Amino acid sequence: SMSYTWTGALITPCAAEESKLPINPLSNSLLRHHNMVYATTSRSASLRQKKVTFDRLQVLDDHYRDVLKEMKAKASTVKAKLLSIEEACKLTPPHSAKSKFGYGAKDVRNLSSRAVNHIRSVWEDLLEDTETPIDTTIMAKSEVFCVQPEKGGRKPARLIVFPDLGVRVCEKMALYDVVSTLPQAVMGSSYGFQYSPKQRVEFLVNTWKSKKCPMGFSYDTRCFDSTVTESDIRVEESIYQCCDLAPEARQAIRSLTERLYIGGPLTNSKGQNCGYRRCRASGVLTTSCGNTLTCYLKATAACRAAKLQDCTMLVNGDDLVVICESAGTQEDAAALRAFTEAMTRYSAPPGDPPQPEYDLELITSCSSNVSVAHDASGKRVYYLTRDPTTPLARAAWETARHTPINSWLGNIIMYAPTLWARMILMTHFFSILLAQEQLEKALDCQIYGACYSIEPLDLPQIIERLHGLSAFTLHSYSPGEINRVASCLRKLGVPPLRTWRHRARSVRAKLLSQGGRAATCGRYLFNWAVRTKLKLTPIPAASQLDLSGWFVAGYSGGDIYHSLSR
Numbered sequence: 112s113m114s115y116t117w118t119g120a121l122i123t124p125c126a127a128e129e130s131k132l133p134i135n136p137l138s139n140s141l142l143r144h145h146n147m148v149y150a151t152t153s154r155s156a157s158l159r160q161k162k163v164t165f166d167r168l169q170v171l172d173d174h175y176r177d178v179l180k181e182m183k184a185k186a187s188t189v190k191a192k193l194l195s196i197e198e199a200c201k202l203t204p205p206h207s208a209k210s211k212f213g214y215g216a217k218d219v220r221n222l223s224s225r226a227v228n229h230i231r232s233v234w235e236d237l238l239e240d241t242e243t244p245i246d247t248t249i250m251a252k253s254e255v256f257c258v259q260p261e262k263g264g265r266k267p268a269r270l271i272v273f274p275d276l277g278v279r280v281c282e283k284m285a286l287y288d289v290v291s292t293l294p295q296a297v298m299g300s301s302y303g304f305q306y307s308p309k310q311r312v313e314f315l316v317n318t319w320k321s322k323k324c325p326m327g328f329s330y331d332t333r334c335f336d337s338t339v340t341e342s343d344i345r346v347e348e349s350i351y352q353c354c355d356l357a358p359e360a361r362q363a364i365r366s367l368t369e370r371l372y373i374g375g376p377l378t379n380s381k382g383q384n385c386g387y388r389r390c391r392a393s394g395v396l397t398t399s400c401g402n403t404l405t406c407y408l409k410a411t412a413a414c415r416a417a418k419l420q421d422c423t424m425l426v427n428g429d430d431l432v433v434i435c436e437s438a439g440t441q442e443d444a445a446a447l448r449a450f451t452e453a454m455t456r457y458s459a460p461p462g463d464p465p466q467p468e469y470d471l472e473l474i475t476s477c478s479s480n481v482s483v484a485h486d487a488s489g490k491r492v493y494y495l496t497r498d499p500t501t502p503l504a505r506a507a508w509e510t511a512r513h514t515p516i517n518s519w520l521g522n523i524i525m526y527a528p529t530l531w532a533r534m535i536l537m538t539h540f541f542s543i544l545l546a547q548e549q550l551e552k553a554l555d556c557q558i559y560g561a562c563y564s565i566e567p568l569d570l571p572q573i574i575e576r577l578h579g580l581s582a583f584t585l586h587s588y589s590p591g592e593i594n595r596v597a598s599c600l601r602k603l604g605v606p607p608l609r610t611w612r613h614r615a616r617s618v619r620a621k622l623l624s625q626g627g628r629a630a631t632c633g634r635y636l637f638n639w640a641v642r643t644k645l646k647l648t649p650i651p652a653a654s655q656l657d658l659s660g661w662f663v664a665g666y667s668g669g670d671i672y673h674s675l676s677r
């Protein structure tokens with residue numbers, strides 16, 4: 112079975128597309144080499160299709176079935192709720208793509224009669240029609256990155272596939288509770304999205320330490336969605352089916368599984384049939400959960416086949432990292448060879464062969480890695496970092512062009528503890544906000560795939576709640592880590608780290624002599640920039656009325672929104 116079949120019609124864009132970074136009178140303050148930044152467009156959709164299109168051979172053995180059951184027994188433990196039309200409407204983001212039936216996200220969240228009437232029929236249809244493939248739209252995703260060291264090396268557009276708005280709301284009523292609860296229940300501490308960065312770190316380390324002689328690695332499959340089979344999707348459904356569900360929920364899931372999740376026809380923006388999918392759809396509510404479960408299921412089985420000792424995994428979508436007891440170098444190399452031979456068999460071959468690692472700071476996953484620093488008292492603190500090239504490039508692009516979702520904000524949140532996050536991002540953006548007094552204007556950013564509405568003035572609280580205070584006092588980052596950041600600044604033409612020490616004192620000052628919420632931002636966010644450092648006390652309101660539901664589950668491509676946590 113082929114992951115895709117193409118009729119020749121083009122993946123077309125729904126609007127015009129900006130691909131280059133125009134000469135900015137403020138972004139150059141950030142990055143000077145504009146020709147290094149680029150956003151993906153329809154033009155490269157075909158290169159993507161070729162990467163994404165191939166036959167799938169899958170062989171399932173005893174360990175796989177053994178693991179399936181263990182997972183199912185756990186899922187058996189869950190009672191999932193049917194979400195009401197209203198609840199699901201609220202979960203829809205304000206700029207979620209509009210329906211082909213004459214209403215948009217706004218209409219849906221406002222509970223328009225037209226919108227709710229269509230949703231109801233889409234739901235009724237889920238109960239009356241058990242087999243007709245549901246229409247999906249295929250588009251090229253616009254994403255900004257830095258040119259490849261191979262000079263002019265570019266990533267082709269990634270393809271996004273999703274059903275009409277109406278179906279999406281139905282998916283929510285039918286599966287939102289499930290997709291928010293089953294992953295943990297089934298994978299325990301192995302489910303990654305349940306952890307804030309601070310927790311993901313605690314869990315990696317306490318695990319690494321828990322080993323007499325630790326050996327670890329990260330695994331990532333070559334274009335995972337395409338590797339997901341119809342079989343894999345039905346197994347996924349067998350897992351969902353073990354929950355106690357309402358009758359209509361149970362049929363909605365069952366119908367959604369055959370009509371949408373296993374495959375369906377592909378339609379472009381001009382309304383033409385581009386082909387057919389027989390693999391995971393990037394834009395359905397189940398794709399995060401589905402991928403984690405499938406990833407976890409295959410990997411657990413692979414461990415037992417490769418006979419790895421005391422394996423402990425952490426899974427996020429298709430992002431896998433396993434920490435086991437080293438059984439000797441030579442030994443370890445053969446185990447990963449086997450592990451991979453098994454993953455490949457289960458229909459999930461690697462992008463790059465996994466390398467056994469013996470230094471936790473050396474294992475990278477989710478595009479991130481753990482690093483060490485020291486706090487106020489110099490007590491070796493641990494945190495999560497990542498190469499800053501893509502983040503800095505995106506910050507650049509978001510500066511020259513108001514985009515709907517502001518990744519820089521998100522990166523500050525998740526990476527607040529980091530060197531680059533504090534010294535460049537925090538500095539750059541707080542002066543831009545200062546200038547236009549956009550401190551109060553809330554922005555949309557996403558975490559683990561769900562879009563969140565956030566007020567910059569609340570970063571101290573948020574940062575404090577998530578990383579602790581050490582996030583405001585880390586000071587002796589690793590050589591390795593500092594070298595990476597500097598090397599990257601050179602690559603992008605971003606002014607060296609010390610140039611930023613300067614900029615911050617200013618911004619901060621212009622933030623202390625501002626009072627209120629703005630002022631606090633000034634005291635806590637740039638304490639690394641002032642000569643005369645003060646002693647930061649736990650923020651009152653922060654570790655208080657600060658909302659949650661933030662690190663419960665992944666919703667990438669799931670059309671999820673929350674306007675909580677100020």
Ligand SMILES: O=c1ccn([C@@H]2O[C@H](COP(=O)(O)OP(=O)(O)OP(=O)(O)O)[C@@H](O)[C@H]2O)c(=O)[nH]1
Nearest residue numbers: 331332333334335336393402428429462667668
């Ligand atoms: O919302 C989405 C979209 C995509 N995917 C799928 O999960 C994988 C996570 O993508 P990766 O970071 O693994 O990149 P890759 O090397 O596997 O594939 P290239 O993207 O760089 O082409 C993607 O490659 C995609 O196929 C999801 O799981 N969820």
Ligand SMILES: [Mn+2]
Nearest residue numbers: 332334335429
């Ligand atoms: Mn992948």
Ligand SMILES: [Mn+2]
Nearest residue numbers: 331429430477
């Ligand atoms: Mn990945």
